[PDB]
A paper describes a structure:
To prove whether LIR2 interacts with the LIR-binding site in LC3, we solved two structures of an LIR2-LC3 fusion in two crystallization conditions. There are two molecules (molecule A and B) of the LIR2-LC3 fusion in one asymmetric unit with LIR2 of each molecule interacting with its symmetry-related LC3 molecule. The first aromatic residue, F29, of LIR2 interacts with the first hydrophobic pocket (HP1) consisting of I23, P32, L53, F108 and the alkyl sidechain of K51 and the second aromatic residue L32 interacts with the second hydrophobic pocket (HP2) consisting of F52, V54, P55, V58, L63 and I66. The salt bridge interactions of residues LIR2E28 with LC3K51 and LIR2D30 with LC3R70 are observed in both structures. F52A mutation led to the reduction of LIR2 binding by about sixfold (Kd = 3.14 µM), while R70A mutation reduced binding affinity about 15-fold (Kd = 8.10 µM). No binding of the free LIR2 peptide with the LIR2-LC3 fusion protein was observed under these conditions, suggesting that the LIR2 peptide competes with the conjugated LIR2 peptide for binding to the LIR-binding site of LC3. Therefore, RavZ recognizes LC3 mainly via its N-terminal LIR2 motif by binding to the LIR-binding site in LC3.
L. pneumophila inhibits autophagy by injecting an effector protein called RavZ into the cytoplasm. RavZ functions as a cysteine protease and irreversibly deconjugates mammalian Atg8s from PE to inhibit autophagosome formation. Unlike Atg4 that cleaves the amide bond between terminal glycine and PE, RavZ cleaves the amide bond before glycine. As a consequence, the RavZ-cleaved Atg8 proteins cannot be relipidated, leading to inhibition of autophagy.
Numbering used by the authors: -16 to -3, 4 to 117
Write the structure that this text describes.
């Protein structure tokens, strides 16, 4: 009888992101200030994926990255700061996906992937 006897229930259970801490206009003004005073740097927000239990949390989520730095170098930096073991899986996701081009400047990435507010958002995880 195709599991007709089985019913579903939503199980409930019992620290804010940058977008939660700052309004859109506040973020746009931050980016304006960065563009004015640090024209060769890319504003980048890096946060831990919601629900990630393997990787620790970083002490800083807001970064200025020199234009020439590529994703491989950024991954190395973040892994070092998280103090990960060499065999630990790690992914740095931009708009939910891994970047294919890991040798190109982050400014080039920025032009494709930036948020409407002008920040570039990344999330790190031990999967995806």
């Amino acid at each position: 009888h195709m599991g007709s006897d089985i019913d579903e229930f939503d199980l409930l259970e019992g620290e804010k992101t940058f977008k939660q801490r700052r309004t859109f206009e506040q973020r746009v003004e931050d980016v304006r200030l960065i563009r004015e005073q640090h024209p060769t740097k890319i504003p980048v927000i890096i946060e831990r994926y919601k629900g990630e239990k393997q990787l620790p949390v970083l002490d800083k989520t807001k970064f200025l990255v020199p234009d020439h730095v590529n994703m491989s170098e950024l991954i190395k930096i973040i892994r070092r700061r998280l103090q990960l073991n060499a065999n630990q899986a790690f992914f740095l996701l931009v708009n939910g996906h891994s970047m294919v081009s890991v040798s190109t400047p982050i400014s080039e990435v920025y032009e494709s992937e930036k948020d409407e507010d002008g920040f570039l958002y990344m999330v790190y995880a031990s999967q995806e």
